[PDB]
């Protein structure tokens, strides 16, 4: 029903950095007493929401001094008056004035860090996986920045695209990174039709693609 | 910093139904509305409805009125979601949350699916045959999740990079890097640990040269 508008959806900000977050409702936010019943809410990785701001504007207890919250009528803000490392996570609004309750989309916020590339590393088939007769292959594109990375595999120089499956971690809070596995799995009849399996990362950090690869000797 | 107790996870068939547990403590469970919020991966948080513990008063989201069912017991302190008919798009976390008071419990992953819990193959990851090392750890075939991965008993938490497992078919594969030192490995063994509490799985991994 009521529809709340949160932009932008990914926020990129340096430590330090003073952001802001914007919520639009598609309605008149008073309830039936005077107050207006919008909320923010972060939601740090791995766990639940926390409550940061309730009621547009007033701080919730053990919350930090640096974030606060305005608006009125239709549009709403939440600003971060320094963002330290603590604030990464997602980012709601809320709105209560109206049954049901409806969450904005969210905002993601990534630390802004140096660039740093791709430590790559790459594993042949384990013997154990061997003698079952599958053959994976693992390749971790480990602690780059930014984000945006693409994997590529390479099979005696030919591409090879069916078979991977990729993951990613989130933004690390120690170090502001980012990391991605890929595993590349065939039969063991396959495996061994081949010699050269490669591993090649573009990223922003290189105009030449960072590749590791071996041979099955 | 949690009120709340909530079971971890679930596994449910397509068209069963589960009953999820809310177990309030240290406060006046009778006192506050408790509600109930979903999240599936990827985000995005939906309300479901609420209910009132000391009358048992619900209000539902339209959204979810055909599919949840909102309960107390006042004697136990506790508190339930019943969600019925159970299809894929019924997999996510869910929430319960005193909201006048932000208490929230850890949510429950619901996984919706036919598949048999299946246990997982471990295989070690050696480097191949200059200053610092990398070992890996994979993990492969199992069913649902989760899966409970340390390394060296979570010594080396520094240095670690477990992947979120992915799914394909039913079956989850699992990835961690560990980096230390050169100096570290083979020097010192480095075990990678995995429990599967689904199919009481609970193995170690040694990581050895490979030649
Ligand atoms: C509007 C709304 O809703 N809101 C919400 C609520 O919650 P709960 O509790 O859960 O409830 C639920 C209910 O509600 C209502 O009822 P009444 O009777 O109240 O009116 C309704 N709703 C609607 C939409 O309608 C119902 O439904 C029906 C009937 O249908 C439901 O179910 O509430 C809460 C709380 O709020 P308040 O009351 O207002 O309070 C608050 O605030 C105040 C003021 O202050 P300043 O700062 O602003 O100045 C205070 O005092 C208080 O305190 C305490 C602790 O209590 C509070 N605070 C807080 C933080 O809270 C809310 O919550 C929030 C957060 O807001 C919600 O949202």
């Known amino acids: 029903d009521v529809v709340m508008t949160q932009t932008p959806l990914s926020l990129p900000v340096s430590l330090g950095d003073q952001a802001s977050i914007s919520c639009r409702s598609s309605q008149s936010l008073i309830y039936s007493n005077g107050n207006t019943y919008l909320h923010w809410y972060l939601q740090k990785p791995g766990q639940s929401p926390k409550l940061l701001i309730y009621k547009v504007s007033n701080r919730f207890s053990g919350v930090p001094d640096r974030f606060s919250g305005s608006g009125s009528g239709t549009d709403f803000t939440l600003k971060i008056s320094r963002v330290e490392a603590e604030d990464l996570g997602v980012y709601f609004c809320?709105?209560?004035?109206?049954?049901?309750?409806?969450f904005g989309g969210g905002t993601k916020l990534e630390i802004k860090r140096a660039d740093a590339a791709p430590t790559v590393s790459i594993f042949p088939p384990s013997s154990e996986q061997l003698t079952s007769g599958g053959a994976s292959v693992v390749c971790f594109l480990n602690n780059f920045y930014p984000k945006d990375i693409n994997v590529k595999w390479k099979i005696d120089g030919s591409e090879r695209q069916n078979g991977v499956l990729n993951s990613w971690t989130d933004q690390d809070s120690k170090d502001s990174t980012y990391s991605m596995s890929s595993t590349l799995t065939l039969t063991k009849d396959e495996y061994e039709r081949h010699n050269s399996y490669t591993c090649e990362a573009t990223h922003k950090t290189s105009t030449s693609p960072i590749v590791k690869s071996f041979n099955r000797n | 910093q949690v009120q709340l107790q909530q079971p971890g996870s679930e596994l449910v068939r397509p068209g069963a139904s589960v009953k999820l547990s809310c177990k309030a403590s240290?406060?006046?469970?009778?006192?506050?509305?408790m509600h109930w919020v979903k999240q599936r991966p990827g985000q995005g948080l939906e309300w479901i409805g609420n209910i009132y513990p000391g009358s048992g008063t619900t209000n539902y989201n339209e959204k979810f009125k055909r599919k949840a069912t909102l309960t107390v017991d006042t004697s136990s302190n506790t508190a339930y979601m019943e969600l019925s008919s159970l299809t894929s798009e019924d997999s996510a976390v869910y929430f319960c949350?005193?909201?006048?008071?932000?208490?929230w419990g850890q949510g429950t992953s619901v996984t919706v699916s036919s598949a048999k819990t299946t246990a997982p193959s471990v295989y070690p990851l050696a480097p191949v045959c200059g200053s610092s090392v990398t070992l890996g750890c994979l993990v492969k075939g199992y069913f649902p999740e989760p899966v409970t991965l340390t390394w060296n008993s979570g010594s080396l938490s520094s240095g670690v990079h477990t992947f979120p497992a992915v799914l394909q078919s039913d079956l989850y594969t699992l990835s961690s890097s560990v980096t230390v030192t050169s100096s570290t490995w083979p020097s010192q063994s480095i075990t990678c640990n995995v429990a599967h509490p689904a199919s009481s799985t609970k193995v170690d991994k040694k990581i050895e040269p490979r030649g």
């Open positions: 240290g406060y006046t469970f009778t006192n506050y509305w």
């Open positions: 949350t005193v909201v006048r008071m932000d208490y």
């Open positions: 809320s709105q209560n004035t109206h049954i049901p309750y409806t």
